[PDB]
Amino acid sequence: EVQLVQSGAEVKKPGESLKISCKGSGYSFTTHWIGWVRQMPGEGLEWLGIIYPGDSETKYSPSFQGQVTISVDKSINTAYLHWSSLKASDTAMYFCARRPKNYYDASGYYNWLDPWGQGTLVTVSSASTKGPSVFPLAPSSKGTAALGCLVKDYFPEPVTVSWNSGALTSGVHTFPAVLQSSGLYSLSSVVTVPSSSLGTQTYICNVNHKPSNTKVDKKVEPKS
Amino acid sequence: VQLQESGGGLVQPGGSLRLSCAASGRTISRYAMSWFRQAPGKEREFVAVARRSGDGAFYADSVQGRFTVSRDDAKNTVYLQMNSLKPEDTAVYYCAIDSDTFYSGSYDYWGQGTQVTVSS
Amino acid sequence: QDVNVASITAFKSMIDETWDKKIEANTCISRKHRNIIHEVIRDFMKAYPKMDENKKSPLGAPMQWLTQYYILKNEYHKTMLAYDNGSLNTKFKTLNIYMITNVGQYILYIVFCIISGKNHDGTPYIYDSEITSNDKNFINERIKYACKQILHGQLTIALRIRNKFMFIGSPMYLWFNVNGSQVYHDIYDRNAGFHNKEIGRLLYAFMYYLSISGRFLNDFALLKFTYLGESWTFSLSVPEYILYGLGYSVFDTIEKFSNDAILVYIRTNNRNGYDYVEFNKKGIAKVTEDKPDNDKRIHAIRLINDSTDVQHIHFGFRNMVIIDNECANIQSSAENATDTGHHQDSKIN
Amino acid sequence: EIQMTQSPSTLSASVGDRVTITCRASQSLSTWLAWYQQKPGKAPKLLIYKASILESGVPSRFSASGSGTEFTLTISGLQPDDFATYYCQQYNSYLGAFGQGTKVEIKRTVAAPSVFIFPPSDEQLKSGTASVVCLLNNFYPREAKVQWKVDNALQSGNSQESVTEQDSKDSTYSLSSTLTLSKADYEKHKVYACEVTHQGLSSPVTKSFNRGEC
């Protein structure tokens, strides 16, 4: 019925411009404010500003005034959020939401309405597309052993990791990637197995990075 | 900072005890308080933790459904109700303060422990 | 701090008298009680009249009358709320817009909200951590909200009870960047029931005049009032419901920008009429008569010139520019303004 | 807008529990407060508006009340799909700031972490960087302290942590801590140690290696 449909994930570099979109359907688009709110990785929610589509009146949070532009194209029921020059600190999930024309009147205030848009992920890094380097996390020489693969310096997300081409799934933990100060991601995938298997069973992690068309298969064995 | 445990003793299987630990030289309402136990020839093992009031109690799987930890902030005291006791619960029981208000288990201050024996 | 305890005493006596007085169809606030209300709001302002240098608004909003930071250290606020072992505060805490039926409830609720810096929903007009904000989006909007709610709350009562003439204004400082035409159209376009000729007629007159005459008229200003740094300009006659509603006094600073005659009505007299002072020249118009008591005091100005839009001349008609003390005879539009009675009046000068 | 304080930051509870989340402000917001639920990778979903009114379609186990300066969201009987992060939000504003959030997680018995340390591989050293990885496996509750010591010197600012979501089957966490050094820095030192504290451990657990030993 009512839907706010946002544009797809973006991968950009600092200094580049960007315009993301929020398409409103199933309600009176010109008479509801559109607001933009962002959620940085692992953080809470912070408003950027709002626009009234009927006449394009805008109200910006002072934190974002002069750094973004909010606009609308009424003919396609679309609101936009624009940067002329992205910062690496603009990496976040961006949501849009609608609100009644009189979001206050003399009798009180009115909340933002559901549903929000589904979110647009914006990733800003100086990195270019780059496949990972994979390194063994070798099982210790010292009845359960851990071993793994370090998946280092790739861009952008995602990477997927299997073990033994999918034959080994029990005890696998593949950690969420961390963005390094270099602008590249890194993660580890680990698995616990019987120590008595270390001499007889082959362990290979299969690391797939579709954006770079990269697949690395790395054997992990005790170090001699 | 003193921790003095009491309330142990000898009970028959299926019996009950209530341990207490009274803290002095510092108000403990701001800190999680844990119980540990150690049987002869075994390592010390976690039993239960009462976090600050409102943050909950957490338990080892060896005592679930049988033991209850609680606290009396007004009296600077914590308690371990021990029901349906088994021979394998025999140990010296210790109370410790978690010095980290963020609950990482920084166990600097320990009581000397009090003895529990469950025997047929 | 300059705390006028006299108006606190008078206010207390007014609430005691009117607490259980039922609002009927024509019930109105008497001249005496209007003047007490007017004094209370002005005395509240005067006790802590300026922001502190280390805690002021970069937008120039008058936070000293809008925030708990200042109001809770305003000794007039404190003395009023503590008066008679806090008995008015006890009564005030029982009230909200939906249950009010009596005159003293209505006055106590509206006025204690204002001199506590509270909306009818219980929020402060502006939050303390917002005093220093330069975000005009919420500073200006909070004040529009507060101003509209004072008036709309009263209209909601008038419509529920079907009352014609109860009225307390939104004081002048709560019109900070507030557009009067928008206030008027916001409220009236949204509730057809307020248009009924037997409902909310002085509230209507106050908002209608402000919808056609903005606070700052620039080159078209003929008069300017200033009280504690809050200024307002006019180019028409200025009815008593405007000066009473905004909290201005004919004893404030009044400046004339033309050589047009004005008649400044200041008091009732002993022959069923009014006494007025005439001014003519450009410059400061200072009333030097003694300030009349609450029984007798009037604030109203008739402007005389040859260039006023014919549709606005009626604001200066005698029995419209001054609020009738017989409630049923109060006038509020061009359809019932009359200009008889001048025989009873006297030029003081 | 004004600062709100939402508490607790993590609420450990079970299906069937009555749980309460609180939001406080130093001055009154009247009824102009909303409650939202958010699951990972999804948009926030409105539960409550005007401090106590259920959004249409929201199940009746959700309720909320407000005094103006204190607001409580109560889930009267947590159900299996209520594990999520919850936010209060003031909205007497053209924007409307959110609270810091409350994660409602599945409660279970304590499990101390199993700890493992991994030295940098010879291959990685050939590239001029050394990553040292410490693994804390399958532990509960979430709070833990992980410290790197290099020749018994405490490290700061040169490691990064990653933690899994609560395991879909056993509801534990696992965590990695990765120490990153230049090859040159790595070869200036001998003893690499990861030291772990957790409320389920009576004493800190240390796993360590000497550079160059097998």
Side-chain angles (χ1 to χ4, degrees):
Chain A
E1 318 291 337
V2 173
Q3 317 168 243
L4 295 185
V5 175
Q6 294 184 243
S7 46
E10 299 276 357
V11 179
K12 314 290 299 186
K13 296 192 172 63
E16 291 182 334
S17 58
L18 175 63
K19 189 186 218 179
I20 62 174
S21 66
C22 173
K23 277 148 158 41
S25 62
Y27 71 96
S28 171
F29 174 82
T30 57
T31 64
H32 289 77
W33 297 78
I34 294 289
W36 289 97
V37 61
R38 77 177 184 188
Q39 186 165 37
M40 291 182 308
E43 303 268 29
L45 297 145
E46 179 176 17
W47 293 97
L48 287 81
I50 71 182
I51 189 164
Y52 186 70
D55 62 5
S56 282
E57 188 195 3
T58 56
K59 300 177 182 162
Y60 294 100
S61 164
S63 303
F64 293 87
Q65 176 91 49
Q67 314 196 61
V68 297
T69 306
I70 299 164
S71 69
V72 296
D73 185 344
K74 290 150 71 165
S75 74
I76 48 169
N77 277 23
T78 302
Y80 298 101
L81 176 57
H82 178 264
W83 295 261
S84 57
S85 180
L86 285 160
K87 299 179 188 65
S89 66
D90 291 322
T91 295
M93 179 73 71
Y94 290 81
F95 300 103
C96 58
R98 88 198 186 283
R99 201 175 185 183
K101 168 185 180 186
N102 300 125
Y103 55 80
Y104 71 92
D105 59 27
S107 77
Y109 285 84
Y110 300 83
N111 52 283
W112 296 92
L113 302 176
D114 269 18
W116 290 19
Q118 83 275 19
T120 292
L121 181 62
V122 177
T123 300
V124 185
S125 173
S126 67
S128 297
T129 302
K130 183 192 173 301
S133 297
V134 179
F135 304 112
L137 299 171
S140 174
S141 68
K142 316 301 173 190
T144 294
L147 56 99
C149 282
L150 171 61
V151 181
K152 199 168 171 279
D153 289 342
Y154 67 90
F155 191 82
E157 301 214 64
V159 132
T160 64
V161 183
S162 64
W163 286 85
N164 290 350
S165 296
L168 171 59
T169 51
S170 163
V172 172
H173 292 295
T174 299
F175 290 95
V178 171
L179 190 52
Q180 305 165 111
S181 57
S182 66
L184 299 166
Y185 297 98
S186 179
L187 67 76
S188 285
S189 173
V190 298
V191 61
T192 53
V193 305
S195 296
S196 69
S197 76
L198 293 177
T200 60
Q201 173 62 48
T202 299
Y203 297 103
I204 296 171
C205 66
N206 323 105
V207 181
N208 202 72
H209 186 238
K210 222 289 169 176
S212 67
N213 193 39
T214 293
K215 185 177 181 288
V216 182
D217 308 298
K218 179 68 62 181
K219 177 172 61 182
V220 189
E221 66 199 355
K223 195 175 182 189
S224 77
Chain B
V1 182
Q2 293 301 314
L3 304 163
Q4 291 173 265
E5 300 102 335
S6 58
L10 167 69
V11 294
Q12 74 295 351
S16 300
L17 292 168
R18 182 179 175 93
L19 309 188
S20 193
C21 182
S24 60
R26 182 182 305 181
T27 301
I28 65 179
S29 54
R30 287 168 31 80
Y31 307 99
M33 307 286 289
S34 296
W35 288 94
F36 285 83
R37 65 188 179 175
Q38 185 164 6
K42 302 178 65 189
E43 298 306 299
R44 193 165 300 195
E45 77 185 32
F46 175 87
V47 175
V49 56
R51 291 178 169 191
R52 285 183 297 275
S53 298
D55 286 336
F58 298 74
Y59 297 92
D61 45 46
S62 59
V63 302
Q64 60 164 75
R66 294 185 308 123
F67 293 12
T68 303
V69 64
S70 62
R71 54 195 306 153
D72 186 342
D73 289 339
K75 295 183 181 184
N76 225 39
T77 301
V78 305
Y79 305 96
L80 186 67
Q81 181 63 41
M82 306 163 65
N83 296 334
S84 306
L85 283 165
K86 304 178 191 289
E88 317 87 78
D89 295 316
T90 300
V92 174
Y93 285 69
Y94 305 85
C95 185
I97 298 166
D98 182 353
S99 286
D100 179 16
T101 61
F102 295 98
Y103 296 144
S104 72
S106 186
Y107 294 121
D108 301 312
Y109 301 110
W110 289 78
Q112 296 303 292
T114 201
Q115 186 183 64
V116 171
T117 301
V118 189
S119 168
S120 48
Chain C
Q1 298 186 25
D2 182 12
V3 177
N4 180 37
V5 178
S7 66
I8 294 175
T9 307
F11 185 83
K12 175 61 162 67
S13 177
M14 172 178 60
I15 300 308
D16 287 0
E17 175 180 297
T18 63
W19 181 243
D20 292 299
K21 169 181 177 176
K22 176 183 181 181
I23 304 174
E24 302 287 357
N26 285 320
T27 303
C28 78
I29 300 177
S30 72
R31 172 167 303 290
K32 186 174 66 171
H33 288 164
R34 287 197 316 270
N35 284 326
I36 290 163
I37 293 166
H38 194 248
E39 282 285 277
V40 163
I41 292 162
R42 292 166 55 81
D43 288 342
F44 157 75
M45 297 172 65
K46 187 184 53 163
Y48 209 113
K50 293 179 176 191
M51 285 165 284
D52 302 338
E53 198 192 9
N54 63 1
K55 195 86 164 164
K56 59 174 181 169
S57 167
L59 307 179
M63 296 304 187
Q64 69 272 28
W65 304 313
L66 302 174
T67 59
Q68 299 302 287
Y69 184 95
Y70 289 99
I71 290 170
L72 292 181
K73 66 181 179 172
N74 176 311
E75 292 294 330
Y76 185 94
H77 167 87
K78 290 168 75 187
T79 303
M80 170 76 85
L81 263 65
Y83 198 72
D84 182 39
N85 290 303
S87 70
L88 292 175
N89 198 18
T90 298
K91 288 186 177 193
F92 172 64
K93 287 171 181 169
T94 72
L95 301 177
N96 60 64
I97 284 296
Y98 307 101
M99 52 76 70
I100 286 165
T101 61
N102 297 327
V103 170
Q105 297 173 324
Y106 185 118
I107 300 174
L108 178 61
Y109 187 67
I110 300 297
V111 171
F112 262 33
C113 278
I114 294 169
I115 69 175
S116 308
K118 295 306 184 58
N119 291 306
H120 301 165
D121 66 9
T123 62
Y125 292 154
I126 305 274
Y127 291 112
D128 284 1
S129 70
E130 297 171 337
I131 285 165
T132 63
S133 180
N134 79 324
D135 185 344
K136 67 175 178 173
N137 304 315
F138 68 75
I139 294 295
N140 287 338
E141 285 178 30
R142 289 214 190 284
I143 292 169
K144 295 176 215 308
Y145 176 72
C147 182
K148 285 205 286 185
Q149 183 158 103
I150 289 172
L151 301 167
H152 180 268
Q154 292 179 70
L155 284 172
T156 298
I157 298 171
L159 180 67
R160 170 167 51 78
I161 304 178
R162 305 211 57 81
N163 167 258
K164 205 169 169 174
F165 291 123
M166 293 292 291
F167 170 58
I168 298 169
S170 176
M172 90 289 282
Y173 54 88
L174 280 164
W175 292 83
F176 188 77
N177 289 330
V178 176
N179 183 293
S181 175
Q182 281 173 20
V183 162
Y184 173 80
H185 284 278
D186 283 354
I187 287 174
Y188 282 87
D189 296 0
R190 283 164 208 178
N191 315 255
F194 298 161
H195 294 262
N196 187 285
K197 260 30 96 179
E198 314 307 322
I199 302 300
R201 287 300 93 192
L202 277 177
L203 290 148
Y204 160 78
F206 180 74
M207 280 179 270
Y208 177 76
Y209 183 107
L210 298 179
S211 80
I212 54 89
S213 201
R215 173 170 196 173
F216 293 118
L217 300 174
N218 56 86
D219 299 340
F220 295 98
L222 301 179
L223 301 172
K224 179 175 154 187
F225 280 68
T226 302
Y227 177 63
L228 301 179
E230 293 296 302
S231 285
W232 207 285
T233 65
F234 301 101
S235 66
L236 303 171
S237 288
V238 193
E240 187 168 27
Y241 53 80
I242 294 295
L243 292 180
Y244 160 72
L246 292 178
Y248 280 114
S249 169
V250 299
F251 293 90
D252 290 333
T253 306
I254 299 167
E255 185 170 4
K256 294 178 87 291
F257 301 108
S258 68
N259 294 314
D260 300 321
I262 57 172
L263 316 178
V264 182
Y265 296 91
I266 71 167
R267 70 201 180 199
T268 61
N269 71 27
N270 70 343
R271 57 212 198 73
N272 197 52
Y274 314 120
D275 295 338
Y276 59 93
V277 181
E278 174 199 13
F279 301 93
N280 305 86
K281 305 312 178 308
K282 293 163 179 173
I284 304 298
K286 191 185 176 188
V287 174
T288 66
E289 306 297 311
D290 295 342
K291 178 180 175 177
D293 287 350
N294 292 325
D295 277 325
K296 297 174 179 179
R297 195 159 66 245
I298 302 173
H299 309 275
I301 299 182
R302 184 170 200 148
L303 169 78
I304 299 173
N305 62 11
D306 61 357
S307 65
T308 304
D309 185 344
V310 65
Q311 67 187 330
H312 297 318
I313 60 179
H314 73 280
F315 297 131
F317 290 2
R318 177 179 184 271
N319 305 314
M320 171 102 171
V321 80
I322 294 165
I323 300 167
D324 202 307
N325 214 33
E326 180 164 359
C327 298
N329 292 338
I330 291 172
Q331 301 173 354
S332 62
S333 77
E335 308 184 7
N336 52 48
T338 68
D339 213 357
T340 54
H342 295 284
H343 190 269
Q344 303 164 122
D345 298 349
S346 292
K347 184 185 270 76
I348 287 180
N349 299 65
Chain D
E1 305 177 350
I2 59 171
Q3 186 57 60
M4 296 190 305
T5 302
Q6 189 175 341
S7 62
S9 51
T10 301
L11 204 165
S12 311
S14 300
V15 170
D17 284 350
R18 174 174 197 278
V19 310
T20 295
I21 303 179
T22 301
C23 186
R24 296 191 173 90
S26 70
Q27 293 189 271
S28 176
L29 304 169
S30 177
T31 56
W32 313 127
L33 184 127
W35 289 97
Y36 285 86
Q37 181 194 68
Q38 187 179 31
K39 288 171 186 186
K42 306 296 187 200
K45 173 193 139 211
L46 182 63
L47 307 171
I48 300 287
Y49 64 98
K50 205 162 175 178
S52 62
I53 301 188
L54 265 68
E55 175 72 353
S56 166
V58 171
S60 68
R61 67 184 174 278
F62 293 88
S63 70
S65 66
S67 80
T69 54
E70 189 176 80
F71 301 81
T72 65
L73 174 74
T74 298
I75 311 172
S76 292
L78 214 53
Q79 286 191 18
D81 57 338
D82 298 338
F83 298 97
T85 297
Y86 296 79
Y87 296 95
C88 59
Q89 187 238 1
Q90 79 204 256
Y91 63 78
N92 54 332
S93 168
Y94 76 115
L95 306 176
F98 289 85
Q100 300 87 351
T102 296
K103 183 178 176 180
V104 178
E105 66 163 16
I106 295 183
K107 192 164 190 177
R108 55 150 293 151
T109 51
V110 174
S114 288
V115 184
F116 301 90
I117 187 166
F118 300 97
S121 68
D122 290 339
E123 187 185 359
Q124 188 186 18
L125 283 195
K126 294 179 197 183
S127 77
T129 292
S131 299
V132 195
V133 177
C134 185
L135 166 65
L136 283 61
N137 209 32
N138 297 343
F139 60 93
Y140 186 86
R142 167 64 179 86
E143 297 84 358
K145 181 164 74 277
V146 184
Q147 300 189 305
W148 285 99
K149 291 178 178 176
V150 178
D151 285 332
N152 214 42
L154 181 62
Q155 304 292 291
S156 187
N158 53 359
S159 58
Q160 296 188 283
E161 288 185 350
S162 185
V163 63
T164 56
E165 287 295 287
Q166 250 190 320
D167 182 74
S168 62
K169 306 177 190 180
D170 66 25
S171 303
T172 62
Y173 297 98
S174 294
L175 177 151
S176 67
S177 178
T178 305
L179 180 71
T180 305
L181 314 171
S182 65
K183 176 188 169 57
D185 277 6
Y186 177 68
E187 299 180 323
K188 291 170 186 172
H189 299 104
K190 178 174 177 185
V191 183
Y192 288 83
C194 178
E195 181 180 319
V196 173
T197 303
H198 183 268
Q199 275 183 344
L201 297 165
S202 59
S203 296
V205 167
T206 298
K207 300 294 171 180
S208 70
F209 65 88
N210 297 318
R211 176 179 56 79
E213 286 176 25
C214 271

